[PDB]
């Protein structure tokens, strides 16, 4: 199974698998230096003797996150896959954050949007990931009400670990479950929700 | 923040390279042939950051528990790298790094397989910092389940361990600031 997965909702997270062999790469900081990543990735593809043509699925994160980062990551994936119609797995960044956490139980994912607001979701992670409150934007006051309502055992605020390995595992699962879509269908239903 | 390279080869290969607020993290898992590329990648990253090795403030290296060969190799790699310049070295406990790589707080059991019938095992209290309730040791598999019944951990990091290269960099930065680094000739 050949997989490439990319999330740009906060940092740059890239995951590359060919069979039992997985590279993971992250970058955070000033944008000037992210330039080196395509080069780096090409080198890793060359090492694995993998051509973009041979990928079974490409995973991309659809947010919630920063607009700029997300449109860059998505346009990148849309373009890479376009010539060969490689199935795309749209990945929920909040769900990738939850599953990147090795503990189980009631989890609350939040992250700053402007001034006095946050994006926010809560999941029961005891199977399983099972949504109790789907991601949306809330005031800080409502955030406290929500926390006080779900007494989450685990809470992942602001600086979110996403594991590229989980991205890759998640693209694989969507592929197998026939829940991937075509590159031309990622605008329409990244708008609608 | 400063200029830091850190590396743990206790199970998979984890690498963090930071310059100020810029940080690259790399991990590899799978057959050893392909690890050949990691040093090329890391040199491209260093050139991209305008970092020479002599510009590094500290180099972190994982010292286990883990696979002995992989530890020996990661350590040897570090010795080759820093001995010309005596860059301060931060030894990193792999289980502590694993525990710290987990977002949740509470009582954390960390365990990995050591040989037929045995695990390396440790227990920490995560409440803000990390506090060793039991330092790493080799227990029998029966002892392991006893340790588990008995400490009632909220969280259990077993056999397949997530270590975040960002965490290795943060830790190396700390030991440097606390002057609890050592010389390349002192690592084991």
Residue numbers in the entry:
A (entry chain A): 1 to 193
B (entry chain B): 0 to 187
Give the exact sentences the study uses for this entry.
YeaZ is involved in a protein network that is essential for bacteria. yeaZ is an essential gene in many bacteria, such as Escherichia coli (yeaZ), Salmonella typhimurium LT2 (yeaZ), Bacillus subtilis (ydiC), Streptococcus pneumoniae (spr0129), Pseudo­monas aeruginosa (PA14_16710) and Francisella novicida (FTN_1148). A recent study further demonstrated that E. coli YeaZ can interact with either YgjD or YjeE, with YgjD as the preferred partner, suggesting that YeaZ is part of a protein network that may be involved in DNA metabolism and cell division. TmYeaZ belongs to the actin-like ATPase superfamily, which typically contains a duplication of ribonuclease H-like domains.
The crystal structure of TmYeaZ was determined in space group C222 at 2.5 Å resolution using the MAD method. TmYeaZ is composed of nine β-strands (β1–­β9), six α-helices (α1–α6) and four 310-helices (η1–η4). In TmYeaZ, the first ribonuclease H-like domain is composed from both the N-terminus (residues 1–100) and the C-terminus (residues 160–193) of the protein. Compared with the other two YeaZs, TmYeaZ lacks the 20-residue αβ insertion between β9 and α5 in the second domain. As a monomer of His-tagged SeMet-TmYeaZ would have a calculated molecular weight of 24 404 Da, it is likely that TmYeaZ exists as a dimer in solution. Based on its structure, TmYeaZ by itself is not likely to be an ATPase owing to the absence of a clearly defined ATP-binding site. The most prominent common feature of these proteins is the prevalence of the sequence motif GPGXXTGXR located at the N-­terminus of a helix (α2 of TmYeaZ). Other conserved residues of the YeaZ homologs that are clustered around this motif include residues from the N-terminus of α1 (Lys32 and His33), the C-terminus of β1 (Asp7 and Thr8), the C-terminal portion of β6 (Arg112, Ala113 and Arg114), β7 (Tyr119) and the C-­terminus of α6 (Pro188, Tyr190 and Gln192). We speculate that part of or the entire conserved surface is involved in mediating protein–protein interactions between YeaZ and YgjD (TM0145) or YjeE (TM1632) in T. maritima. As the UNL is close to the conserved surface identified above, it may have functional implications; an alternative explanation that cannot be ruled out at present is that it is a crystallization artifact.
